[PDB]
């Protein structure tokens, strides 16, 4: 009879991650970790410390790769009418997805566990001012890390910067990238070949016939420095505009000045590049573009009738 099954998850120390798993492809058979303010050690099969190979996990649908050392739980040998304890240590490695949201001071794993540290914590040029909730000795950034795939057993030639964090339950590792050019608070949504811009009533109206949408903006431009983490907008807008101009308007039109930035009601950031023929805050965006479409529709019809009827008036007059 099972009288109790204590199942725990312990982190793998750095010196076992780098020296053993990443280098030799093996993992220690004993887990030595601090739990509940006490340094416990667990020996696999109640036996001596050993290096065990990491073999691929059984295939499951729509799941990332996994490796484990032991597949069978060890239970004590039978002794008549005696409570007997048996240990089983299984060293597990799982590639997972990790997700973060603004302000990117904490990120989540696909297992539903959290890691209370910014994904971009590091060692170079202010990469240590990012939020951390753990002690400084729980973090280790190995610079120039040679990842060795545990299936193909081939060492990657190009080194990468690898953050490692030893949480009380597990140990995460991920490639390090700078925060500023990786995240953004704005996403490129649409590319408009012909965005006609008009000025009227101290406002700019940008009308796109391709998608049937009219935005309204204040006369002034939008200070791009005001956008938090706004390093992606410039690059994306420039690349898109260059591609699109090369695709269509190279032979007939020319660019006029640097791309301008305007803010449109509902929270839409329009980068506009004018053409001539050869002759710190976070912006909240509405979830329904429909109003703008309506505007364009109401504009279009109106304009036409306000033309046609007007001609009739003159035609009547004469």
């Amino acid at each position: 009879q099972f009288m109790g099954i204590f199942e725990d998850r312990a982190p793998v120390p750095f010196e076992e991650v780098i020296d053993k798993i990443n280098a030799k492809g093996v993992c220690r058979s004993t887990a030595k970790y601090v739990r509940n303010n006490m340094e416990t050690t667990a020996f696999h099969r109640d036996d001596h410390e050993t290096d065990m190979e990491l073999k691929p996990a059984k295939v499951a649908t729509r799941t990332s790769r996994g490796w484990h050392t032991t597949d069978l739980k060890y239970n004590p040998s039978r002794v008549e009418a005696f409570h007997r304890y048996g240990t089983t240590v299984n060293c597990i490695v799982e590639e997972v997805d990790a997700r973060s949201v603004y302000p990117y001071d904490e990120f989540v794993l696909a297992t539903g566990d959290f890691v209370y540290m910014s994904p971009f914590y590091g060692y170079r040029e202010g990469s240590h001012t990012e939020h951390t909730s753990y002690a400084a000795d729980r973090f280790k950034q190995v610079d120039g890390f040679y990842a060795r795939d545990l299936t193909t057993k081939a060492r990657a030639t190009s080194p990468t910067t690898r953050n490692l964090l030893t949480t009380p339950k597990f140990t995460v590792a991920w490639d390090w990238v700078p925060k500023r050019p990786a995240v953004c608070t704005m996403t490129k949504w649409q590319e408009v070949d012909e965005m006609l811009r008009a000025e009227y009533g101290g406002s700019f109206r940008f009308s796109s016939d391709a998608i049937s949408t009219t935005f309204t903006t204040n006369l002034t431009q939008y200070s791009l420095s005001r956008v938090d983490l706004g390093d992606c907008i410039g690059r994306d807008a420039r690349e898109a505009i260059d591609r699109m101009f090369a695709r269509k308007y190279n032979a007939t039109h020319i660019k006029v000045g640097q791309p301008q930035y305007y803010l449109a009601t509902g929270g839409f950031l329009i980068a506009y590049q004018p053409l001539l023929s050869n002759t710190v805050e976070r912006i909240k965006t509405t979830s329904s573009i429909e109003f703008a479409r309506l505007q364009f529709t109401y504009n279009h019809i109106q304009r036409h009738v306000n033309d046609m009827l007007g001609r009739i008036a003159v035609a009547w007059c004469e």
Epitope: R124, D137, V142, D143, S158, P159, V177
Partner: antibody
Framework: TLKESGPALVKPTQTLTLTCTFS??????????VGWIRQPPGKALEWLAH???????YYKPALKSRLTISKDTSKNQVVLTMTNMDPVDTATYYC??????????????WGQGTLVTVSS | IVMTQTPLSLPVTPGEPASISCRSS???????????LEWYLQKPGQSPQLLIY???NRFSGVPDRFSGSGSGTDFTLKISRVEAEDVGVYYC?????????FGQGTKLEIK
């Protein structure tokens, strides 16, 4: 601002310890790192080790098995230990401070360095 | 990554430009997109001092004569007008990828 302290005469096959005293920075700020460097007389500079503010020590792989760098912020010092001394290691040792935490250039301020000779 | 500084000894008459080149076995490009290759100078009986960082940036307190360039695995220090005080040993050092290393260094000679 980085001092250099170490036995000038150490017999072969013995443990060696050094010390680097700081001034104007503490190895407890979020972006301080201190490195130990060696230069044999008349040969090129050789990087040996460096420690970050969070006890993240990195060694030279060739000398990994022997070097041991430790930090004590209470005294505001770094102790570099090199076991199994070898007369090939007679050289001048320098202590450097790194601003990779803040600037793209490392090893700005060096100590005067101390000459250590391995002989009986 | 191993740095190979060439030539080992560079005798140059004062006023004439001097060239030092070092090559690495592997790209010193970091995931930042920056190459942390820096040139240091050691004067006779003196602690070595940094001259150039990030290939093409001159450290504070360094005159315009020193100029770094290059990319990938090749890098070149150029002194447009060598002076009397330029005598010393020059090192190129890569910090992007642990383990770090210095080149063999080049000794300047004045003729």
């Amino acid at each position: 601002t980085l001092k250099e302290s170490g036995p000038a005469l150490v017999k072969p096959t013995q443990t060696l310890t050094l010390t680097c005293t700081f001034s104007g920075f503490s190895l407890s700020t979020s972006g301080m790192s201190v490195g130990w460097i060696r230069q044999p007389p008349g040969k090129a500079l050789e990087w040996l080790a460096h420690i970050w503010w969070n006890n993240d020590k990195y060694y030279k792989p060739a000398l990994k098995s022997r070097l041991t760098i430790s930090k004590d912020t209470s005294k505001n010092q770094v102790v570099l230990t090199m076991t199994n001394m070898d007369p090939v290691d007679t050289a001048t040792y320098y202590c450097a401070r790194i601003y990779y935490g803040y600037r793209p250039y490392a090893m700005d301020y060096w100590g005067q360095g101390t000459l250590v000779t391995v002989s009986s | 990554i191993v740095m190979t500084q060439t030539p080992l000894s560079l005798p140059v008459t004062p006023g004439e430009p001097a060239s030092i080149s070092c090559r690495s076995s592997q790209s010193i490009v970091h995931s930042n997109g920056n190459t942390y290759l820096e040139w240091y100078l050691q004067k006779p009986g003196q602690s070595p001092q940094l001259l150039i960082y990030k290939v093409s940036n001159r450290f504070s307190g360094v005159p315009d004569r020193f100029s770094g360039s290059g990319s990938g695995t090749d890098f070149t220090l150029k002194i447009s007008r060598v002076e009397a005080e330029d005598v010393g040993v020059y090192y190129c050092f890569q910090g992007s990828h642990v383990p770090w290393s210095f080149g063999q260094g080049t000794k300047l000679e004045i003729k």
